[PDB]
C-alpha cells in the first residue's frame, strides 16, 4: 500500500471526485490532473473540509488532455506514480461538432495519456481506463433488444455512424477511445497492464459538494430534471437503461488496480434496469415534501425497456468486484438529499 501512488486524470469531474474521495478514504497517495490552478485549489479545499488527509492529495495542471504530450510534464514531476486512472473525457451532449468536440478529444486524449505513461511513467504498473457500457451494447438502429451482452461484447457502431448526432457521438467516442487502447497495447506492447471500467448510467451524490443545484453532471440530470421542471417549465425527457451508483463505480476503479484477475478485463458496471418514471416513483414516495412539484410524465413519451435494451450478464464482473451494489432507491435518495 505505502508504495502505491495513484494518478487520476480529470480529477474535478463527477466520477473522478468520487474516485479521489474513495482513494483518500483508503489512504492512497493520489495525484489529480486538473485544468487550472483554481480547480486544483478548489478540490484541495473540498478534501480538507471533508476531514480527509489532504496531504495525500496533490494536483497537476493539464489544461487539455487532447494536446499532444499533455501528461508529459506531470509524469516527469511524479516518477513515483504506479497506477494511472484515465477518467477524463467529454461526457456531455452540450456540443455542436461531434468529431472535433467528442471523438478526437476522447481518442487523442487517450492515446496521449498512453504515450505519456509509456515514455515518462516508468513505474506505472497498472492503467485503468474509464470506458462505458456504451462500448459494450448497441444503441438505436444497432440495439439488440433481448440479446445477452457481457464483458466481451462490443457495440458495432462505426466511426461514421457516431457522427450522426451528439448521443451517438458520445457512444462512439467511448467505443473508439477503448479500441485505441487495445490497439496501443498491440502496437507498443507496453510493460504496464490495463483494466477497463465500463459503467452504464451513473447516478448518485456528488463526492463533496453540489456546485450548482440547478444543473448537475449529465447522467444525474436524469434525476435532477424531474426536480427542476416545476421551475423551468421544461418537460423532462424520459430514459430507460441500466444504472450504477457512482460510489460502486469509484470502488470498482480501486478493485481494477488492486486485484490481479482484473488485468485485461472490462468490468461491466451495471446494477439494474431503471426508467425515468421509476425514479419519479422513488422521489415522490421518499420525499413527500416534493410531490407538489414533480411533473406528470406523459406515458406515451416513455421508452420501453424491452423495445431497445440488451440483457446484461455481468456475473463475472460481480464476482471479481466482490461487493454488493447500491440499489436504485438509495442512489436516488442520496442524490436528492444533496438537492433538497
Ligand atoms: N456519468 C456516466 O453516466 C458515465 C460516465 N462515463 C465516463 O466517466 C468519465 C467522467 O464522466 P463524468 O464524471 O460523468 O462527467 P463529468 O463531466 O462530471 O467529468 C468530466 C471530466 O472530464 C474533464 N475534461 C473533459 N474534456 C477535457 C479536456 N479536453 N482536457 C481536460 N479535462 C477534460 C472535465 O474537466 P473540468 O472538471 O475541468 O471540466 C471533468 O473533470 C468520462 O470518461 C465519461 O465518459 C462512462 C460511463 C457512463
Describe this structure in words.
The chain is of the alpha/beta class. The chain has a single domain, classed as 3-Layer(aba) Sandwich (Rossmann fold), CATH 3.40.50. Helix content is 41%, strand content 15%. It has twelve helices and twelve strands. Strands 3-2-1-4-5-7-10 form a seven-stranded parallel sheet, sandwiched between helices. A three-stranded mixed sheet has the order 8-9-11. β4, α4 and β5 form a beta-alpha-beta unit. α4 packs parallel to α6 and α9 crosses α12. The longest helix has 23 residues. The radius of gyration is 19 Å and the shape is globular. Bound molecules: NADPH dihydro-nicotinamide-adenine-dinucleotide phosphate. The site of NADPH dihydro-nicotinamide-adenine-dinucleotide phosphate has 25 residues, from α1 and β8. NADPH dihydro-nicotinamide-adenine-dinucleotide phosphate (NDP) binds next to α1 and β8. InterPro entries: Epimerase_deHydtase (IPR001509), NAD(P)-bd_dom_sf (IPR036291), NAD(P)_dehydrat-like (IPR050425). Keywords: Nucleotide-binding, Oxidoreductase.
Compact overview of the structure:
This is Epimerase domain-containing protein. The chain is globular and about 55 Å long.
> What's the number of extended β-strand segments?
12
**Small molecules bound:** NADPH dihydro-nicotinamide-adenine-dinucleotide phosphate
Strand content: 15-25%
State the end-to-end distance: 39 Å
Family: Belongs to the NAD(P)-dependent epimerase/dehydratase family. Dihydroflavonol-4-reductase subfamily.
Protein name: Epimerase domain-containing protein
InterPro entries: Epimerase_deHydtase, NAD(P)-bd_dom_sf, NAD(P)_dehydrat-like
Keywords: Nucleotide-binding, Oxidoreductase
Amino acid at each position: 500500500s505505502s508504495e502505491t501512488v495513484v494518478f487520476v486524470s480529470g480529477a474535478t469531474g463527477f466520477i473522478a471526485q468520487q474516485i479521489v474521495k474513495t482513494l483518500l478514504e483508503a489512504g492512497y497517495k493520489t495525484i489529480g490532473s486538473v485544468r487550472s490552478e483554481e480547480k486544483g485549489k478548489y478540490l484541495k479545499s473540498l478534501i480538507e473540509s471533508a476531514g480527509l488527509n489532504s496531504n495525500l492529495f496533490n494536483y497537476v495542471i493539464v489544461k487539455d488532455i487532447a494536446a499532444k504530450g499533455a501528461f508529459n510534464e506531470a509524469l516527469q514531476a511524479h516518477p513515483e506514480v504506479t497506477v494511472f486512472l484515465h477518467t477524463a473525457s467529454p461526457a456531455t451532449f452540450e456540443i455542436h461538432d461531434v468529431e472535433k468536440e467528442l471523438l478526437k478529444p476522447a481518442i487523442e486524449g487517450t492515446i496521449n495519456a498512453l504515450n505519456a505513461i509509456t515514455v515518462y511513467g516508468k513505474n506505472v504498473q497498472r492503467v485503468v481506463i474509464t470506458s462505458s457500457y456504451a462500448a459494450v451494447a448497441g444503441f438505436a438502429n444497432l440495439a439488440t433488444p433481448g440479446k445477452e451482452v457481457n464483458e466481451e461484447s462490443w457495440n458495432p457502431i462505426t466511426y461514421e455512424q457516431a457522427l450522426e448526432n451528439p448521443f451517438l457521438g458520445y457512444i462512439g467516442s467511448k467505443k473508439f477511445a477503448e479500441k485505441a487502447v487495445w490497439n496501443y497495447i498491440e502496437e507498443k506492447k507496453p510493460k504496464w497492464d490495463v483494466t477497463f471500467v465500463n459503467p452504464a448510467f451513473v447516478l448518485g451524490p456528488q463526492a463533496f459538494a453540489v456546485r450548482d443545484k440547478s444543473k448537475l453532471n449529465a447522467s444525474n440530470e436524469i434525476i435532477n430534471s424531474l426536480l427542476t421542471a416545476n421551475k423551468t417549465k421544461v418537460e423532462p425527457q424520459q430514459f430507460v437503461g441500466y444504472f450504477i451508483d457512482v460510489r460502486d463505480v469509484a470502488k470498482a476503479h480501486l478493485i481494477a488496480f488492486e486485484k490481479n484477475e482484473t488485468v485485461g478485463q472490462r468490468l461491466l458496471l451495471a446494477n439494474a434496469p431503471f426508467s425515468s418514471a421509476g425514479i419519479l416513483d422513488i422521489i415522490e414516495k421518499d420525499f413527500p415534501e416534493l410531490k407538489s412539484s414533480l411533473p406528470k410524465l406523459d406515458k406515451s413519451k416513455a421508452p420501453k425497456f424491452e423495445e431497445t435494451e440488451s440483457v446484461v450478464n455481468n456475473e463475472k464482473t460481480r464476482r471479481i468486484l466482490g461487493f454488493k451494489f447500491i440499489d436504485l432507491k438509495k442512489s436516488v435518495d442520496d442524490t436528492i438529499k444533496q438537492l433538497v
